[PDB]
Design a protein around this ligand. Sequence first.
Ligand code: HEM
Ligand code: HEM
Ligand code: HEM
Ligand code: HEM
Lengths: 141, 141, 146, 146
Amino acid sequence: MLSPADKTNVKAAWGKVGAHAGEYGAEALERMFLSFPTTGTYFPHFDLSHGSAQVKGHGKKVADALTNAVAHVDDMPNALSALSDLHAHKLRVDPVNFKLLSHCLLVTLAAHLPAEFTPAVHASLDKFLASVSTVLTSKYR
Amino acid sequence: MLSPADKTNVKAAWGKVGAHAGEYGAEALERMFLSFPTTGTYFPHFDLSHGSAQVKGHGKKVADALTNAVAHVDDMPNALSALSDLHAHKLRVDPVNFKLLSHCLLVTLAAHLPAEFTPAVHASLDKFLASVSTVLTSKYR
Amino acid sequence: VHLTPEEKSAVTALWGKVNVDEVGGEALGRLLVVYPWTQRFFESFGDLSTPDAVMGNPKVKAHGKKVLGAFSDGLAHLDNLKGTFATLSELHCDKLHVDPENFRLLGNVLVCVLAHHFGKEFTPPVQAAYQKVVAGVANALAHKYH
Amino acid sequence: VHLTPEEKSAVTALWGKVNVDEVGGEALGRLLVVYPWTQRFFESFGDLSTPDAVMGNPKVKAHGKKVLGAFSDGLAHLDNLKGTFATLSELHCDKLHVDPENFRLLGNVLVCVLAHHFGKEFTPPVQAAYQKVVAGVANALAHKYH
Ligand code: HEM
Ligand code: HEM
Ligand code: HEM
Ligand code: HEM
């Protein structure tokens, strides 16, 4: 449950991301694949090599969805219904993995938004990614 | 989210627990302490000896709370608010421990309800314990 | 693993009483029913639409028997699980692409199945020994992932 | 842990650029802020009511340096984190009653602080090696729990 401060914190931080979200999407994945190699089991059809167009393209897709979620911070469940469906009924990624991508996205933002990555913003973003995670895994069973 | 099916399943299995809830709660704790010793760090003030009155006493308390969530299966967030607050604000039990107690509660029920512990009931009961856990951890941050 | 001798005996005594054929089918079916997401690997198994469809599917029962078969072997080399499971670990990773979290879910399901079957005989301390065992196998199975 | 010579060098060399004082006070404060429940062990520290209050608390800052200190000394025994943290492992269990999960949370916080600090320098491959170390340390600290 995101507080008003949190929603603010999140909108500010993502606000700074701007035209780079896609690149940050890609970089988070790359960090995820190297750090938690088990996450690769969901992408056997991809080339996980550095700067792979597949990873790149996928980073964009993840970024855009995050953007959309920040924009509908108030109506997440609804803004991401289709994605919750896709993941629950088609992809079927085990829920433990959502914590792994979340962490990699923090790391990525930390490394690129030094001034903006304060302890309070760090707390908000974590809660945010947790909420996004919850929504995407809400129809699993 | 619990379906009508789930609710019937839960009321039915818990129905059978009846008057044994206390003893089953105590037993779930003991199994938890023996299998996942790190959970003991929250009970430094307890005698965790076999048949400790404290554990016995604590088992009733937990069982009473679960019985209470079954009784209010359509308003759990409210029926458990108090307990949600206690856990978030005073006890501050790390979230991963909930999944550990859940698991041991499932083990105990299985060991005592061979006839009712069907695949379908097992699934409903798991979803139920996950929901109770989600409630008790909702106010953590 | 860290199994006291008295833990290794209790594991072994009980295991003597298990019908690997039956327990195998039960554990695998219960997994597909409690954590439906795990069905992702078995779309060629057919109808897994309801609990009855899963539990009674001849392919699920057969597979379960295979899995528990391999697990029973693991119980005789409790000293070298990583060794024992090496080729299987490589296969689950490189060919099957099975996320190792699946192995921990299956372990927990197996413990419930053993509790279901043995009732009171599955004492707090026997479960503690089996918890150590299922964790070691899941670890062994994941050891070759890269 | 199971660090490659290359991975060993990357850890070793970034560390050398670390101001333990600052990184340690920041890791511990962020921990208290991001995961508020960790504050259950620091009641005696004072006012942890706000991010500002945590980050400023010198008791926090000083505890942070003591923790990173010990951690720092552990990177010198990357081949025996277990024997290096054995007494610290018994202490956390038996005297402090600290749930090992906290070790994992800090590790993760630690990695976000390093990225925060080194931006560019903290590349994916360098993060991977640190991830292996934080896991390794957490594992070692949890080792003597019973
Ligand atoms: C932060 C939470 C996540 C978000 C917002 C997210 C979002 C997305 C989006 C937008 C897509 C593309 C949908 C389309 O093609 O229209 C997607 C697909 C996919 N996601 Fe998720 N995802 C998340 C977490 C995960 C995790 C943790 C994994 C696995 C570890 C994962 C695995 C996949 C896979 C395998 C695909 C399909 C890739 C392909 O075949 O092109 N997702 N996700
Ligand atoms: C869904 C599972 C849980 C339920 C229903 C539950 C319920 C309760 C209840 C009813 C009490 C007593 C409060 C009172 O005095 O009125 C309690 C206290 C407590 N619980 Fe929880 N709890 C759960 C999970 C956990 C877990 C997983 C842990 C740690 C492993 C934990 C640690 C404690 C502690 C340390 C106390 C205080 C005991 C005492 O000093 O008397 N709880 N819980
Ligand atoms: C105790 C843990 C497990 C053991 C010992 C085990 C063992 C085995 C064995 C012996 C095989 C056949 C190998 C071959 O085809 O050459 C197999 C195949 C397979 N296993 Fe595992 N397994 C385990 C857990 C799992 C779990 C939990 C899953 C998925 C949730 C899984 C997914 C599969 C799949 C998809 C196949 C191939 C089936 C086919 O199409 O023929 N396994 N396993
Ligand atoms: C990197 C992992 C950690 C290391 C290396 C570590 C190390 C230390 C050291 C060297 C001490 C000094 C106490 C003494 O020698 O008497 C200490 C104390 C303590 N640690 Fe840990 N620690 C770690 C993680 C944690 C975490 C995550 C927590 C809780 C969130 C924690 C809670 C405490 C507490 C409560 C004390 C006692 C301080 C006092 O006496 O006021 N530690 N730790």
